[PDB]
Amino acid sequence: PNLQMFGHTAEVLVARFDPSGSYFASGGMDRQILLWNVFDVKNYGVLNGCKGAITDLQWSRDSRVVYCSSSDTHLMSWDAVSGQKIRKHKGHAGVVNALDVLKVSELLTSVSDDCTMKVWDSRSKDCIKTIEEKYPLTAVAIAQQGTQVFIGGIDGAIKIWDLRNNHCSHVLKGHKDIITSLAISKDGSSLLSNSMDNTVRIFDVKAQRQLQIFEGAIHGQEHNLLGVAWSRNSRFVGAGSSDKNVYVWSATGDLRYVLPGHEGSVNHVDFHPHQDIILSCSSDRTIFLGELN
Amino acid sequence: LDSLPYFESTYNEEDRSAAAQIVEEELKRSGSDRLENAIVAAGKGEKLAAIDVQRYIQLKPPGTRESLLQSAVVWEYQKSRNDNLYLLEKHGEKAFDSSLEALEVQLELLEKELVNTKKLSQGCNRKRKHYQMEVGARLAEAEVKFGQLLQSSIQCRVATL
Amino acid sequence: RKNLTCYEFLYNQERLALPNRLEAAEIELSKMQQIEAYAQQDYARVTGQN
Amino acid sequence: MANVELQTSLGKILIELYTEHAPKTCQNFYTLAKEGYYDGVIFHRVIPDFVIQGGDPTGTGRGGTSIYGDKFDDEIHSDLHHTGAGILSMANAGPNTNSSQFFITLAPTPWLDGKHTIFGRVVSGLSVCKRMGLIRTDSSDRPIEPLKIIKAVAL
Amino acid sequence: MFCSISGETPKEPVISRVSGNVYEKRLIEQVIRETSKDPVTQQECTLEDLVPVKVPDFVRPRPPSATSLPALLSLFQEEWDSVALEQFELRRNLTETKQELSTALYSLDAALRVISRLTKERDEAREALAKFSD
Amino acid sequence: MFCSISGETPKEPVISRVSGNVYEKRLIEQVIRETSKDPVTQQECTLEDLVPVKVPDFVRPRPPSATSLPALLSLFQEEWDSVALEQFELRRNLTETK
Amino acid sequence: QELSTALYSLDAALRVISRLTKERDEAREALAKFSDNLSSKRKRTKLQPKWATDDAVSQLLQATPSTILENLETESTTSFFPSPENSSFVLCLHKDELLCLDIQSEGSALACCWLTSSKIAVATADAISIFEFPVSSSGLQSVGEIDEKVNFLQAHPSGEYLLAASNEKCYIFSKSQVYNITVAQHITSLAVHPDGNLFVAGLENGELRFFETSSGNELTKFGPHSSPVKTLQFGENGYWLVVTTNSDIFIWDLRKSELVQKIPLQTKVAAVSLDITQLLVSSDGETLYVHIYVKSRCMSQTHVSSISNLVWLNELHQLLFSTSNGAILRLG
Amino acid sequence: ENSQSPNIQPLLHTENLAPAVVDNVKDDLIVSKGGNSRELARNVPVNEMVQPALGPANPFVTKEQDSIKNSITGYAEREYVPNFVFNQEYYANTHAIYGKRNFDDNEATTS
């Protein structure tokens, strides 16, 4: 099958599976996160409260608590079993754009239009660290180790920071413009990155040079943050584009699947943790589950 | 045990000649019937067919009591012959072409089995092909990762000094 | 018929040999990853002395 | 150098095959006709005063394969040209992409000389190819009634 | 259309009900008396278990030069020549298949020892590259 | 050569194992699906009971001819069995003349 | 069907080797270019302390000096058998130091074998004969007649048959007499494997030929030596063979048919005699040396003047014996 | 030795070039056929997806027939552009049109 489920009122942004592979969550401009099943593809809770639009979901690695990143500074927290509020992580003085989580579900990183990175504990309700750069930040990724945090800004310079040192250790180079989504592999050994130059580049974690520049997935005037993912094997790379197409790569530098279906710009493509399924979201208010037999 | 035929396109005749020598060196190391069957095997071994009655055809006029018999043999078989050619000509070519039709039904059945074998033979090879291409990729994936470590382990040690 | 029974047999003996081919290389890969996994740590400990 | 007979829903068509010129083109066609591959197939293109192509098992336009595997090379000779009305020739998607599909010209076509592999000419049923080539069509040059191939006999 | 014992074209074909295969009656009736079982499948089979089949009968055109003379002399001679020199040549073919069997299995086992010898060789050479790094 | 139900030349002959007779598969299959029986003898028969016509196994045959040893032996029966009746024509006519 | 499935699977399994060989090869230059940039048995400690304890020169004639061959009786190793330059075969008792018999009958004696029955002994010679003797009757009971010098002599496991080799290119079992048409050259030595089914013959053109006795067939050939084979010895372990030629001793594993170790002596050294005790291997010729088989040198004697022609182990390696061109039989 | 090896290798390699290529091509067409005509429901690789038409191409074909038109004049399809982008886009285009009529470039937009 394919399954193009409808439900949201307005532009949807982010849609992700549990780490387990038993649910979706989705939510964009609706101010409504809508949970789903995978295997009778039905809705669940209408997580209501966020007074800004959602920009990023992420399941806790317990598969119970959910975290948002509203446009009104809040980062909310939700008990996916019951569906009640837990907290309002009040901090930033602007619009949050990305979130990331660890193994230990306890630490979270967010990224504002205040040019401020901030690490959060799920127990304090306050910031543990505050890394002020200069130009409004956009994408962030934290490693599996719980050590390296990658920041993506407007300079095209993916900076790398550790939790012990807090020094500008390294800076990725050769990306001319804008970053819309970082993504660390299931190894902890390589990033993915969507630039506004349409060069969906991979980078190294440890020597730190490029690997493979992919090219063929356009951003334009919309200025949405488009996403990228690593497949459960780390064989395939799934980048969406404003051309209504989900450009899946071969990770060897070869375009295999280029499946259309959406009527509007695509945002955050994902992969299921085990069985080969693709979550693809788009302003359109629609979502697909593209499979491979 | 495993040796990919479809995938291995770089297997030369020299490699067969090479591997044949290594297999050859391991070989240098290791180093109901009765009387019927007796006369039949003797006839085939000796390459000689048993002689039949070469008598009826030749014969001779003013012979004796012996050729009086041989003469009377020729008559009865000639009358049987001329009766044996009458019942053939009566039917004639109808009896022959009726058997010719049977031979065409017999022939076409064999070539239908040639096709059934042809299809299932190509069908088995067709399944093998996919398996070869599946794993040959996985082996390619392994070797790339192998070469990455090989140089990665070096570049770690080079810097440590 | 001879070639049918050949390709029939070739299928059965080959199909088992590939898992054994791969599983060997799979374990061969696992060991290579360990040397990669440690060699980094000694490099990482160069920054601790500084 | 053997002929072939086609039985359609309009009439019978006999065709000579120039196998001496084109051995592979008349090896592919002849094998599929006998096997029962062209049976129940529609002449999916029909153009008044041009051609009536066929050989689509899928019934789409992007269908059909050869007996060799998927597609084979063309074989052009200067002896064989499109000068006439009723000339059997193989359709293609470039230089070396001949599938099962063929066609029967209704008038002279100098501009198709050098591209497509000609491999036969219609002997009997020239009235059927003129009558078949004047059938009502859609804007996508498809006949409104599917003109089927009922049986392909190999003589 | 043929018999599944002699390689005949049967005059009175009969089919067995345990394994669907047509035999000529005389040849299947002989097998059941020798050992009461089906020759192909080795399943229990008796003479009463058989089922006679009917067909439009088989016709052979007796040659134009057909008499008691060639049928006694030339034709019957050729038949016992063709039986004799074929089975002798067939016994020669069975003898070589067993000899060529022995050359097959020996060369096979010779290859097994090469693989086993090279399986210890390769992985230890790869292992030594892994140890070299240290 | 013929199918006993229709009378056509059957393009897929399958012989039954209750009434020995060569039927066309497509014809006999419909006869079995109507009622599980053999059309001629009306004995019970299923589709698995029916068996296609096959090459014997591994022994190669040759067509039925005058050369073939068994066909030549059944010929010599016809010779003698006819000549035995020829003797009666002369034994019976001798018993009238004498 | 078995023929077809085998031939297909054979050439299929053959492609495994072609692949395997090229990968093995790649591992070599890679690493090369990188690395560039029995409670009674006398044990080795005690054996190492052996010294000459006797040297007997009177077994054979003073005027035709030299002992050319040695064996000990397997059922009593104090009974010694020697072949002389003097054309005589001698039985000597180590305990009593008496010659029990001097056996006469037309050229020097170059091989001797002592039967376990104690009363039968065997010899062979360049006179082309093999002789069977009664010790108690001091007599020759059989003269078995090769067309040229007999180069080797070995008693079968049953005790009932003798294998011989010769310069006439044949081996014989004394019942059958066989040569290799293909090899066609002088056989220089012969020994049975201890189970009595196979044997080895060394050749003048540096081959060790292995034979199946029952089938009378040449089942394997071990190459690698240069010059004439001089001596071969099968171990009682049943899987080792030691061979020598004109200055190496090569060790063969009969299960793998491979030469797994080679002891290379200097190019002047002549290895004339090899024998296992299976703990120890002795060699003799230029001098006497004994090696431990487990780790591959534990004893070295140079008492003889000129060539040592024979060496042997007493029971449980409680002594070593050697014979020389210098006339002596020595015990260590 | 050399004759038996050449027969087995040709048997192993050459057998899959004919029927396996046509059978997999048919199964590739069948999934696309089950997918209908104008909706790729079978998730095929980009290279296999295209599948050109094939044929001689109708020669007469005037300009008016050649374009694929949903609604007579041209193909028309739904769009999902944020309005702010469309409004922003629209104004810039108009200025260029006025400028040509004006005949004045009016410099570049600045801070």
From Swiss-Prot, chain A:
Organism the protein comes from: Schizosaccharomyces pombe (strain 972 / ATCC 24843)
WD repeat start and end residues: 7-45, 49-88, 91-130, 132-171, 174-209, 220-259, 261-292
Keyword Iron carried by entry: no
Pfam families on file: WD40
Cellular localization per UniProt: Nucleus
Transmembrane stretches, start-end: none
Entry GO terms, CC: catalytic step 2 spliceosome; nucleus; post-mRNA release spliceosomal complex; spliceosomal complex; U5 snRNP
Coiled-coil regions listed in the entry: none
Lineage of producing organism: Eukaryota, Fungi, Dikarya, Ascomycota, Taphrinomycotina
Biological role stated in the UniProt entry: Involved in mRNA splicing where it associates with cdc5 and the other cwf proteins as part of the spliceosome.
UniProtKB keywords: mRNA processing, mRNA splicing, Nucleus, Repeat, WD repeat
Protein name (record): Pre-mRNA-splicing factor cwf17
InterPro entries recorded: G-protein_beta_WD-40_rep, U5_snRNP_Component, WD40/YVTN_repeat-like_dom_sf, WD40_repeat_CS, WD40_repeat_dom_sf, WD40_rpt
Description of how the protein assembles with itself and partners: Belongs to the 40S cdc5-associated complex (or cwf complex), a spliceosome sub-complex reminiscent of a late-stage spliceosome composed of the U2, U5 and U6 snRNAs and at least brr2, cdc5, cwf2/prp3, cwf3/syf1, cwf4/syf3, cwf5/ecm2, spp42/cwf6, cwf7/spf27, cwf8, cwf9, cwf10, cwf11, cwf12, prp45/cwf13, cwf14, cwf15, cwf16, cwf17, cwf18, cwf19, cwf20, cwf21, cwf22, cwf23, cwf24, cwf25, cwf26, cyp7/cwf27, cwf28, cwf29/ist3, lea1, msl1, prp5/cwf1, prp10, prp12/sap130, prp17, prp22, sap61, sap62, sap114, sap145, slu7, smb1, smd1, smd3, smf1, smg1 and syf2.
GO aspect biological process, one term: mRNA cis splicing, via spliceosome
Alphabetized SMART domains for the sequence: WD40
UniProtKB/Swiss-Prot annotation, chain C:
Subcellular location: Nucleus
Top-rank taxon: Eukaryota
The family this protein is said to belong to: Belongs to the CEF1 family.
Physiological role: Involved in mRNA splicing and cell cycle control.
Subunit structure: Belongs to the 40S cdc5-associated complex (or cwf complex), a spliceosome sub-complex reminiscent of a late-stage spliceosome composed of the U2, U5 and U6 snRNAs and at least brr2, cdc5, cwf2/prp3, cwf3/syf1, cwf4/syf3, cwf5/ecm2, spp42/cwf6, cwf7/spf27, cwf8, cwf9, cwf10, cwf11, cwf12, prp45/cwf13, cwf14, cwf15, cwf16, cwf17, cwf18, cwf19, cwf20, cwf21, cwf22, cwf23, cwf24, cwf25, cwf26, cyp7/cwf27, cwf28, cwf29/ist3, lea1, msl1, prp5/cwf1, prp10, prp12/sap130, prp17, prp22, sap61, sap62, sap114, sap145, slu7, smb1, smd1, smd3, smf1, smg1 and syf2. Interacts with sde2.
Protein name: Pre-mRNA-splicing factor cdc5
Species name: Schizosaccharomyces pombe (strain 972 / ATCC 24843) (Fission yeast)
Residues of the full protein shown: 708 to 757 of 757
From Swiss-Prot, chain G:
Chemical reaction(s) catalysed: S-ubiquitinyl-[E2 ubiquitin-conjugating enzyme]-L-cysteine + [acceptor protein]-L-lysine = [E2 ubiquitin-conjugating enzyme]-L-cysteine + N(6)-ubiquitinyl-[acceptor protein]-L-lysine
Main EC class the enzyme belongs to: transferase
Subcellular location field: Nucleus
GO molecular function, one term: ubiquitin-protein transferase activity
WD repeat residue numbers: 182-221, 224-262
This protein's pathway: Protein modification; protein ubiquitination
Keywords: DNA damage, DNA repair, mRNA processing, mRNA splicing, Nucleus, Repeat, Spliceosome, Transferase, Ubl conjugation pathway, WD repeat
Enzyme Commission numbers on file: 2.3.2.27
One term under GO cellular component: nucleus
Family the entry assigns: Belongs to the WD repeat PRP19 family.
Subunit comment: Homotetramer. Component of the NTC complex (or PRP19-associated complex), composed of at least CEF1, CLF1, ISY1, NTC20, SNT309, SYF1, SYF2, and PRP19.
Role of this protein: Probable ubiquitin-protein ligase involved in pre-mRNA splicing. May also function in DNA repair.
Protein name from the UniProt record: Pre-mRNA-processing factor 19
Span within the parent record: 99 to 488 of 488
Curated annotation (Swiss-Prot), chain H:
Compartment(s) where it occurs, according to its Swiss-Prot or TrEMBL record: Nucleus
Signal peptide range: none
Role according to the record: Functions in the second step of pre-mRNA splicing. Involved in splicing intron which are longer than 200 nucleotides.
Self-association and partners: Belongs to the 40S cdc5-associated complex (or cwf complex), a spliceosome sub-complex reminiscent of a late-stage spliceosome composed of the U2, U5 and U6 snRNAs and at least brr2, cdc5, cwf2/prp3, cwf3/syf1, cwf4/syf3, cwf5/ecm2, spp42/cwf6, cwf7/spf27, cwf8, cwf9, cwf10, cwf11, cwf12, prp45/cwf13, cwf14, cwf15, cwf16, cwf17, cwf18, cwf19, cwf20, cwf21, cwf22, cwf23, cwf24, cwf25, cwf26, cyp7/cwf27, cwf28, cwf29/ist3, lea1, msl1, prp5/cwf1, prp10, prp12/sap130, prp17, prp22, sap61, sap62, sap114, sap145, slu7, smb1, smd1, smd3, smf1, smg1 and syf2.
Protein name in the entry: Pre-mRNA-processing factor 17
Organism: Schizosaccharomyces pombe (strain 972 / ATCC 24843) (Fission yeast)
